[PDB]
Amino acid sequence: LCPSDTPEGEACGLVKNLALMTHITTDMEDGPIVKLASNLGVEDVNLLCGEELSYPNVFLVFLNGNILGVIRDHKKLVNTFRLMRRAGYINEFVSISTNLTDRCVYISSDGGRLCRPYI
Amino acid sequence: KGRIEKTLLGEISEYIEEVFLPDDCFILVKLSLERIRLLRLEVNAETVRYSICTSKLRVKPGDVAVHGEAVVCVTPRENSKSSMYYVLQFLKEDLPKVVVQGIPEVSRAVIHIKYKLLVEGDNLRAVMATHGVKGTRTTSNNTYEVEKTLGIEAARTTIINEIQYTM
Amino acid sequence: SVAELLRELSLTKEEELLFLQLPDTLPGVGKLLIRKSGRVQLLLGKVTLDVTMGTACSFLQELVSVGLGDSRTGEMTVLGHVKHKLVCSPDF
Amino acid sequence: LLFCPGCGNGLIVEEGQRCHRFSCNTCPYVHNITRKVTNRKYPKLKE
Amino acid sequence: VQEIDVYLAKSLAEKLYLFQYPVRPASMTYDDIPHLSAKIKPKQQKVELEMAIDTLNPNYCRSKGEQIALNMDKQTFCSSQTTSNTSRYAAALYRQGELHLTPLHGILQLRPSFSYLDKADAKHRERRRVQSYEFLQKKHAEEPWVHLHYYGLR
Amino acid sequence: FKAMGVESDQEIVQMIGTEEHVMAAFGPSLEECQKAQIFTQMQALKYIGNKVRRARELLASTILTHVPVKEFNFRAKCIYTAVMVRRVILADRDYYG
Numbered sequence A: 001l002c003p004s005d006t007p008e009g010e011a012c013g014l015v016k017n018l019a020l021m022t023h024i025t026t027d028m029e030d031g032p033i034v035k036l037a038s039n040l041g042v043e044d045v046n047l048l049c050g051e052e053l054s055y056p057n058v059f060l061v062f063l064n065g066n067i068l069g070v071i072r073d074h075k076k077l078v079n080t081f082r083l084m085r086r087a088g089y090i091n092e093f094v095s096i097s098t099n100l101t102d103r104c105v106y107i108s109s110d111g112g113r114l115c116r117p118y119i
Numbered sequence B: 001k002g003r004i005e006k007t008l009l010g011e012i013s014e015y016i017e018e019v020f021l022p023d024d025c026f027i028l029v030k031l032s033l034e035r036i037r038l039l040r041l042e043v044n045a046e047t048v049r050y051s052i053c054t055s056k057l058r059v060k061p062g063d064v065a066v067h068g069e070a071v072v073c074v075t076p077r078e079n080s081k082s083s084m085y086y087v088l089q090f091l092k093e094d095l096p097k098v099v100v101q102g103i104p105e106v107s108r109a110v111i112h113i114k115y116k117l118l119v120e121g122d123n124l125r126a127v128m129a130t131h132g133v134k135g136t137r138t139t140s141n142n143t144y145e146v147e148k149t150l151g152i153e154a155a156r157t158t159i160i161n162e163i164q165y166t167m
Numbered sequence C: 001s002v003a004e005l006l007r008e009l010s011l012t013k014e015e016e017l018l019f020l021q022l023p024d025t026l027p028g029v030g031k032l033l034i035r036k037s038g039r040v041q042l043l044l045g046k047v048t049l050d051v052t053m054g055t056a057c058s059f060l061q062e063l064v065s066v067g068l069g070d071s072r073t074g075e076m077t078v079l080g081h082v083k084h085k086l087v088c089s090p091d092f
Numbered sequence D: 001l002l003f004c005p006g007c008g009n010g011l012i013v014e015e016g017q018r019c020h021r022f023s024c025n026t027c028p029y030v031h032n033i034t035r036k037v038t039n040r041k042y043p044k045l046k047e
Numbered sequence E: 001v002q003e004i005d006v007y008l009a010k011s012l013a014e015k016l017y018l019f020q021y022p023v024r025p026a027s028m029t030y031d032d033i034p035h036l037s038a039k040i041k042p043k044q045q046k047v048e049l050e051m052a053i054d055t056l057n058p059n060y061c062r063s064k065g066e067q068i069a070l071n072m073d074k075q076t077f078c079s080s081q082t083t084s085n086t087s088r089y090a091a092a093l094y095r096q097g098e099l100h101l102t103p104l105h106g107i108l109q110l111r112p113s114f115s116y117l118d119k120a121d122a123k124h125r126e127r128r129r130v131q132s133y134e135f136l137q138k139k140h141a142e143e144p145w146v147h148l149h150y151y152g153l154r
Numbered sequence F: 001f002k003a004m005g006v007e008s009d010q011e012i013v014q015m016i017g018t019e020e021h022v023m024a025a026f027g028p029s030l031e032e033c034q035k036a037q038i039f040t041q042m043q044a045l046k047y048i049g050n051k052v053r054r055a056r057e058l059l060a061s062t063i064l065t066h067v068p069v070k071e072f073n074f075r076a077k078c079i080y081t082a083v084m085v086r087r088v089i090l091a092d093r094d095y096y097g
């Protein structure tokens, strides 16, 4: 968003303006996202309650807000999806992000996310 | 400062727990005594035992004891309201949050340098009356707690001051 | 601990039941290779190299392998307990 | 919190003869004088 | 470089059903061979057994008496299934010289069945939707003729 | 949690925290408060929901935490509630993710 383009008065920071090189995303199907998630390594509903806990190697994959299993190695998952997206097998817009404070990786195929390109 | 700012039983002690002896389960507090002399404040295991008593946790009898070398207090077990275990798992939470000593209302007191000390609290006349503070020279910034405690005319002078201070 | 199980399997000859999540590949003797540095790779059928390494914490419960023989006409018999799970992933 | 082998319903201590009879099917482990220890060391800020 | 080979062992794995226990991790508890009174279903196993309670713990006594039904005392189980797609997991028995793959059937978790408090409340009373499916099983729940026994088999 | 099918209390802590250090202070909070009234039963603990919801609540627990899907296999729903509790014991509204 533009930092300096805003009204003043009632809407001093409540009516923003999009910048130049942005792109709002549209929705898509979640088929190949799940299909690569379950190959790359995830498992849920068979794991003992204890697993998903303070143990470091339990990053739990979340897609669009629904848990899709847990991965022992977060890096392989974030890196492999990212190489796959760059290769073009997964839609360019989908984003894999990782929060290490709470071990949840976050595959978002939401549609409506503010996006932008980088080199 | 330690005389007027509150310090919970929790702040001054070592490894507390229940301990299981035949036919009972008594709690125990090890009560860090290096600290109590470090933080200038005057508690003792007798003073804790009076303060574990009259502290709304129903330990109002002499059930709480004083073991050791005035270094450890013990309270075993209550009388009713699921008294066998469920009050003891209740007791392990409320015991390190009883105020040992000081004004309970006062959050914390910070010294400032001649020396004075400012508190972030509200209980004025309990602060005004403690030993060491010349209560003739102590003000608030809460104009109601000067009105309840120091008359209306001091509550007039704070409304003059605390506006002319913030202006 | 990824290749440790194989070395521990090497340390005691006792047969160990293992749990394997293969990738979702339909059928279009397999070979397992342990690379130097512990990077176990299963060079499976079709000569594809699938990397399988580590898994969820296991043994934190009793997982038991049982062959149901339809005991009304057979027997349900526990054959083994469980060991660390193993997950197989395709590689790129 | 010590759990029950058999139902798993959490620790209850009956003060009769030192057992751990849970609200469900009795599995009272009458722990002898083994001394219970739970010292949850607290926090002690100073100065 | 252990190059151990994996046999795609065709030894019938249709019999193989993994059983899980999110109940017994405290002391490497093994379920123990002696207990019988075995009852098992093919779909939604609902393993019902003779997990008779010890008497080393001191009698338990009146509360067991207070239990109402205990039949020594069955500690049965109802199988929480997790069989959505069930071929993603198919490993078997592995030496350091040989490796035998076998593709299992649906894994089933086995938490403890109560039904003592369930039946207990009913007793006081005396004083969902298509829950069982269209065919009411009429069979899977009937199937428990069970024999857990010890045999070295592959 | 007992209404959701996981009836035992050992499972619930195993969900919330196996490493105990602060998730032990989940213990005397609620699973004791659950146990303080003799109410260990799955069907009976739908019943307390069956009163306040203004057997009939197997369905009306689908209008609670919706998008975690259930086919009357509530195991996926439990972890998502358990992770919601997991955050609190470990504890930005204006941030553009």
Ligand SMILES: [Zn+2]
Binding pocket: D004, D005, D006, D007, D008, D009, D022, D024, D025, D026, D027
């Ligand atoms: Zn029990």
